[PDB]
Amino acid sequence: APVRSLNCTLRDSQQKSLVMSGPYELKALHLQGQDMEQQVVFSMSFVQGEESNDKIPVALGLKEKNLYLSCVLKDDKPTLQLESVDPKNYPKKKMEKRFVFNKIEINNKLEFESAQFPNWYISTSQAENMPVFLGGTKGGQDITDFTMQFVS
Ligand SMILES: OC[C@H]1CN(Cc2ccccc2)CCO1
């Protein structure tokens, strides 16, 4: 049948919100009150892929935008990009592998591992106003843990 999707926001484990940083990048800021209108609303789609109790393959689209987080090699490195797609064809159940993240639940937090690049994770910096990126460490100074908020 149709792919199933949920609207949501994400915040890193230091409670930074995610906002746009130009058309094809996200950044992480400490936000509260009126400025949380700036927060990215995701459509999280539950897609085809290897699955277990605590590890669920998803795509992360921007709500009602033909833009998806994707993992590609750039200048020879696994990177996070925002990629445009044909809005007639997305979302779909069989998303291409660069769009797939394994959403992993550990100790009441979520990590998003690249399905394409094992042990590379959606990451933020400790500093404010820095890009969201793909990080090859889920253990160090960079933040790889998130919480989800469900949106109407
Ligand atoms: O508050 C002014 C901004 C907030 N908006 C976040 C946003 C981005 C993508 C999908 C849903 C929502 C972007 C355009 O307007």
From Swiss-Prot:
Keywords (A to Z) from UniProt: Cytokine, Cytoplasm, Inflammatory response, Lysosome, Mitogen, Pyrogen, Secreted
Induction: By LPS. Transcription and translation induced by M.tuberculosis and a number of different M.tuberculosis components in macrophages; EsxA is the most potent activator tested (at protein level). In pancreatic islets, release is increased by high glucose treatment. In pancreatic islets and macrophages, release is also increased by endocannabinoid anandamide/AEA.
Motif Involved in interaction with TMED10 C-terminus boundaries: 112-125
Full protein stretch here: 117 to 268 of 269
Mutagenesis / variant outcome for changing residue 117 to C: No effect on binding to IL1R or on IL1B activity. Markedly reduced activity. Markedly reduced activity
UniProt GO BP: apoptotic process; astrocyte activation; cell-cell signaling; cellular response to interleukin-17; cellular response to lipopolysaccharide; cellular response to mechanical stimulus; cellular response to xenobiotic stimulus; cytokine-mediated signaling pathway
Organism: Homo sapiens
Free-text function comment from the UniProt entry: Potent pro-inflammatory cytokine. Initially discovered as the major endogenous pyrogen, induces prostaglandin synthesis, neutrophil influx and activation, T-cell activation and cytokine production, B-cell activation and antibody production, and fibroblast proliferation and collagen production. Promotes Th17 differentiation of T-cells. Synergizes with IL12/interleukin-12 to induce IFNG synthesis from T-helper 1 (Th1) cells. Plays a role in angiogenesis by inducing VEGF production synergistically with TNF and IL6.
Effect of residue 25 to N: Requires 2 nucleotide substitutions
Post-translational modification: Activation of the IL1B precursor involves a CASP1-catalyzed proteolytic cleavage. Processing and secretion are temporarily associated. (Microbial infection) Cleavage by S.pyogenes cysteine protease SpeB promotes its activation independently of CASP1.
Keyword Cytoplasm among record annotations: yes
Note: The IL1B production occurs in 2 steps, each being controlled by different stimuli. First, inflammatory signals, such as LPS, stimulate the synthesis and promote the accumulation of cytosolic stores of pro-IL1B (priming). Then additional signals are required for inflammasome assembly, leading to CASP1 activation, pro-IL1B processing and eventually secretion of the active cytokine. IL1B processing and secretion are temporarily associated.
Site entry: Involved in receptor binding: 4
Activation/inhibition comment: (Microbial infection) Cleavage by S.pyogenes cysteine protease SpeB promotes its activation independently of CASP1. SpeB-mediated maturation of IL1B plays a dual role depending on infection site: while IL1B inflammatory response prevents bacterial growth during invasive skin infections, it promotes streptococcal infection of the nasopharynx by disrupting colonization resistance mediated by the microbiota.
Effect of residue 55 to E: Suppression of integrin binding. Markedly reduced activity
Compartments, record wording: Cytoplasm, Cytosol; Secreted; Lysosome; Secreted, Extracellular exosome
Known partners and oligomeric status: Monomer. In its precursor form, weakly interacts with full-length MEFV; the mature cytokine does not interact at all. Interacts with integrins ITGAV:ITGBV and ITGA5:ITGB1; integrin-binding is required for IL1B signaling. Interacts with cargo receptor TMED10; the interaction is direct and is required for the secretion of IL1B mature form. Interacts with HSP90AB1; the interaction facilitates cargo translocation into the ERGIC. Interacts with HSP90B1; the interaction facilitates cargo translocation into the ERGIC.
Official protein name in the record: Interleukin-1 beta
Site (Important for interaction with integrin): 55, 63, 65, 74, 88
Family per similarity comment: Belongs to the IL-1 family.
Reported tissue expression: Expressed in activated monocytes/macrophages (at protein level).
GO molecular function: cytokine activity; integrin binding; interleukin-1 receptor binding; protein domain specific binding
Keyword Transmembrane tagged: no
